[PDB]
């Protein structure tokens, strides 16, 4: 029924746009017309404005999230954001304070629900638009199905448009009007025993554990032997190299060099990025994150650790080489598995490099925005 998507200028359910739509469902927004009063919660709770780069503000969010965020369809593994994933994610260049948004249990001064934007370019076929990029959302478990969710959407919508932004962009894993593309996810298993001890991995007759093992099991040699950490000095060549590399694409970001220094420099537990440089020149780059998978009710383990493949470019290798090499440098950094999405040119490598198909798909959004909507090679964003 979508009763609560049906009033939002998104698509209705069979809406199907030639490629040349592409434009906003609303136009001419006025920020003068916005509501300045805050969208009424249910009696005893109140809105609360987070603090991401306070420790103890930053944590209740991290303490929310890592028990009640999303889980997979079968609630074996529930995503674990790490406090400091969460400061990156949150603190990127333009950032709004007031766009990171929590709900609090009056009587108990307990966060009980967030949603959150960040400031980000978007281009969609060929026109780029200042956008929200929204994550983060959640409700507790014990307040679900109360309608609380489209409050917190229609708060953070109504902040958003006070700084002359209409349109924004979200994934998700649930089927929501509608979205303009489609990304299954894939897995390359880098520590088979754990995986297939966790119930995420198989074996069979033909494939006993031993097998298994040595099926998976990866040269510690990179490819491009000079693949390193990046550092400071290569922001421009990154932007250079990335920026060029995205223009390809019907959905992208348009980083600034600022944006590349905040979304690529590295951070333990939190973004990697290598480069490959040559006479001062960055020419390759691999870039994958963490996001770990609390395991619920495994009495061996309680933690998956998962690299998630975000951005990669290749001028001096084949494609297939360069993602062999971000399995490698995953591996190396103690990751049991490779994630990644099928977007961009991921799909070409994944049967070569022997990843499995996963259970579902992650689907991206646009809101307040009409196009045509397009197959997953042809997304080149990747949301956290
Ligand atoms: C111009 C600026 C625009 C800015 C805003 C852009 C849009 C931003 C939109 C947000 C993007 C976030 C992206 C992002 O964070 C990444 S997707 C991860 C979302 N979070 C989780 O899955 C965490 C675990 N689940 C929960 O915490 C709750 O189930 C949530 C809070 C999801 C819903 O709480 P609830 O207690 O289960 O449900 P009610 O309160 O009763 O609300 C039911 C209404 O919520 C609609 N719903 C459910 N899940 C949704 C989802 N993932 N997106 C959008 N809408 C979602 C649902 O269809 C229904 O509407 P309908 O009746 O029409 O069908
Ligand atoms: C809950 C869980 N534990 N382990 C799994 C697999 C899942 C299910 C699942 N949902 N999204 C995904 C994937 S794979 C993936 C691979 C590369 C890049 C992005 C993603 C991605 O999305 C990101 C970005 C949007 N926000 C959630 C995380 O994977
Ligand atoms: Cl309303
Ligand atoms: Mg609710
Ligand atoms: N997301």
């Not at 281009?123 to 983060?136: D, G, L, P, Q």
């Not at 959302?137 to 708060?155: G, Q, W, Y």
């Not at 349109?167 to 593309?181: C, F």
Request: proline share 3%.
């Amino acid at each position: 029924d979508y009763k609560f998507w049906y009033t939002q200028p998104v698509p209705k359910i069979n809406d199907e746009f030639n490629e040349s739509v592409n434009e906003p469902f609303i136009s001419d927004n006025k920020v003068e017309d916005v509501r300045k009063d805050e969208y009424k919660l249910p009696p005893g709770y109140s809105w609360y404005v987070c603090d991401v780069k306070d420790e103890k503000d930053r944590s209740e969010i991290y303490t929310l999230l890592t028990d009640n965020y999303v889980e997979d369809d079968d609630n074996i593994f529930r995503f674990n954001y790490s406090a400091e994933f969460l400061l990156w994610a949150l603190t990127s260049p333009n950032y709004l304070k007031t766009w990171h948004i929590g709900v609090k249990y009056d009587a108990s001064n307990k966060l009980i629900g967030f949603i959150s934007a960040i400031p980000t370019d978007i281009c969609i076929h060929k026109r780029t638009i200042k956008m929200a990029e929204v994550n983060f959302l959640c409700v507790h478990k014990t307040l679900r199905s109360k309608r609380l969710a489209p409050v917190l959407i229609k708060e953070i919508t109504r902040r958003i448009n006070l700084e002359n932004i209409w349109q924004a962009i979200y994934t998700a894993g649930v089927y929501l009007p509608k979205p303009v593309s489609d990304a299954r996810y894939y897995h390359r298993s880098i520590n088979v025993k754990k995986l297939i001890e966790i119930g995420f991995s198989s074996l069979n007759s033909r494939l006993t554990m031993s097998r298994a093992i040595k099926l998976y099991r990866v040269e510690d040699t990179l490819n491009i032997k000079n693949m390193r950490l990046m550092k400071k000095k290569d922001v421009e060549g990154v932007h250079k190299l990335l920026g060029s590399y995205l223009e390809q694409f019907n959905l992208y970001a348009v980083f600034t060099k600022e944006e590349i220094a905040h979304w690529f420099l590295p951070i333990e537990n939190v973004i990697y990025t290598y480069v490959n440089e040559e006479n001062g020149k960055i020419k390759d780059m691999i870039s994958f994150y963490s996001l770990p998978s609390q395991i619920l009710g495994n009495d061996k383990y309680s933690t998956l650790n998962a690299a998630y493949s975000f951005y990669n470019v290749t001028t001096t290798a084949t494609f297939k080489q360069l993602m062999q090499d971000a399995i490698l440098l995953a591996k190396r950094n103690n990751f049991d598995v490779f994630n990644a999405l099928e977007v961009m040119q991921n799909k070409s490598v994944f049967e070569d490099l022997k990843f499995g198909e996963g259970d579902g798909s992650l689907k991206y959004y646009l809101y307040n925005w009409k196009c045509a909507s397009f197959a997953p090679a042809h997304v080149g964003i990747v949301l956290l």
